[PDB]
Amino acid sequence: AQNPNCNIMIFHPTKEEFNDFDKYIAYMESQGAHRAGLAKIIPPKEWKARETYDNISEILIATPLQQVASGRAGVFTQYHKKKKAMTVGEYRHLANSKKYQTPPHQNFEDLERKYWKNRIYNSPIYGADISGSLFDENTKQWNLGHLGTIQDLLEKECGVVIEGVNTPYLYFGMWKTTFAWHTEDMDLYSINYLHLGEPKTWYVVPPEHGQRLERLARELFPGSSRGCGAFLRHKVALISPTVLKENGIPFNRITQEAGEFMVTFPYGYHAGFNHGFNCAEAINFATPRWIDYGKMASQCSCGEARVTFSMDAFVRILQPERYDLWKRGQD
Template sequence: MHSKHFGSQNPSCQITIVHPTMEEFEDFRKYIVYMEWQGAHRAGLAKIIPPQDWKARKTYDDIDDILIAAPLQQVISGHAGVFTQHHKKKKATTMHEYRRLTNSETHQTPFYSDFEDLERKYWKTHPYVSPVHGADVSGSLFDENMKQWNTGHLGTIQDLLEQECGVVIKGINTPYLYFGMWKTTFAWHTEDMDLYSINYLHFGEPKTWYAVPLVHGRRLEHLAREPFPGSLRDCEAFLRHKVALTSPTVLKDNGIPFGRVTQEAGEFMVTFPYGYHSGFNHGFNCAEAINFASPRWIDYGKVVAFSMDAFVHILQLERYELWKRGQDRTVVDHTQPTEPSSQFLNAWREVRAPGGPAVRRRHCPSRSASHRHPPVATCHGTRCRAPVDPASPPPLTGPGFLLCCPVWGCGCLQLHGARPDSATDRRSICCGSPPTWTIRSSSSSSGRGDSGSDCPGPD
């Protein structure tokens, strides 16, 4: 295995960069386990450079007609390295029209000598000019016959969400495309439900990423409380709403460790559970992202407001009864990797193996079992188009789901008496903002509109 890491368990929490061989690249789940045993997860972020002969797609010359249904203009306010980011919806456009916009005088990338020079210009001019982000386009640009690291076919335990519950959540267990331009930004956040995410940069200009090591995530949360009091009043976990941004200088001045890395076209980035990350695009580009899960994520998932019944019953059977009674006191250890040869993986293989246990939905709430699939981008040959969804799926309801989030016009429904930083009950933490997870209750009805595409999925 060829990798750049810092000690067998990466005690310094630096961002790992790996160069798998073609043989190693065949098994996505196995390679994620390997990376964690190198300590990659401690940094919250890792970069994977695929084998030279591997290609996600033969050509990108035939995708100009992809529809970006709801571009988002990013409006930035703030100063002294502390900024707030809000979104304004723009009219639909095609990828071809969007590319023309990125090359306009207003939005084109300035001249720069190296990445450090461009980074300085980004932070110096951050509040000026509002870039437009072509975010949350349902679909994939991977060739259909591509088996390795295809975001639509990763084969991780997150597949249980669809297999056991019949639930498809766009951007979570189906891929999203993201079209970026100079200065389009993703603010500090962790992934919805503290899932993993994978981001592949198909083509175009690079993307700069920042990441705070998992063990310092709480310090970032506390740092953000003072400059964003309004957001804090609305939701104590407001960082998950992707609106707050602090510069590297502010992090340094407050003693918060962080890493930075540049992702170039043809490279993957993986974020790990509870890994805070942010970043910006250097110019016109196209990325594809999706969330995924591993057995190590299950204990993270137990403390967010989402039904974990199927995951715990199948993959942690020995702890299932304790968990049902609320007596599973397992504490999440950010430093521990996924076990490479454990009962988790054996159970998962049994579920996925032909002739294995029948897929049943008895471990899922009935509200989820009947949840109909939203449409995703359809591909005819090499042309992909994300259709307009005239009738969004009905929102999930019940005590296991949060109403999130006020920034996007929904509100954050917190459990009474529970503190987000509680060591015994973190269920009140806002677990993200996809509209398919929002609920409407008589006590929180405000007449506000649905969050729609203003609640982006993975970056």
């Protein structure tokens, strides 16, 4: 068995290897990358996502989200308070203000210590989930707006044509902006490209050990667990590395820098935080190996998780027993 310790693997494809996305995902899996739940892909030196980032300031963040925490420093939830619209240029200036900027630090490890110590005492503002792309249309390799769609994959694997579309999303971050512990919708893959700015630190639990994280989460968030049988679908709970280590939960960590891709694998729980002003782009995708994970994915039916239009068909076809109750949650 390749990568039996479930370490995060880092890949350096050549420009030739960067041509065929599906093939390269399958290669990484042949080497055991999926066992970690997360992999890093450093693009060939010849590749670029676009020529420059000099003209992005007029992108609108229609609903910036202030991420307000409740709890203790290593075990907290966050809720999102909607703020007034602002441009990327306005948001960048806000991120660099004295109130929100990254503090002085020695190295990524020191910054990580400061994040876990101090996150809860601040409410950073995240520009998340903005439909769009920063890849140039002429970028032919690993262009996250030109991937094969999940609907086409389901149709190729299973023979059933379904409605829905699959487009990318932009994320504009600042110091302390936080992504809570989650797997993807329908336990899909994700791919995330850090276009510019400061790093993003990731934490991940191997897919084979996901249920250990879920059990800890039920213990640590006992009211939320009674409210919903899949409350991590709400994407609000944070648990620190120290708390995970105290409770014996297997996990790994890695920092993504600008110009790097990260891939999350089916049922790989992940969480993390941004180091400072940055912009990332991410999208879900599927491969043949996903189908079995899609069929078994948990679902929120309490009504809180509320997701995209395209998830309907995935539930309806892969999880027909659950369909009824899940759709009651969505309506």
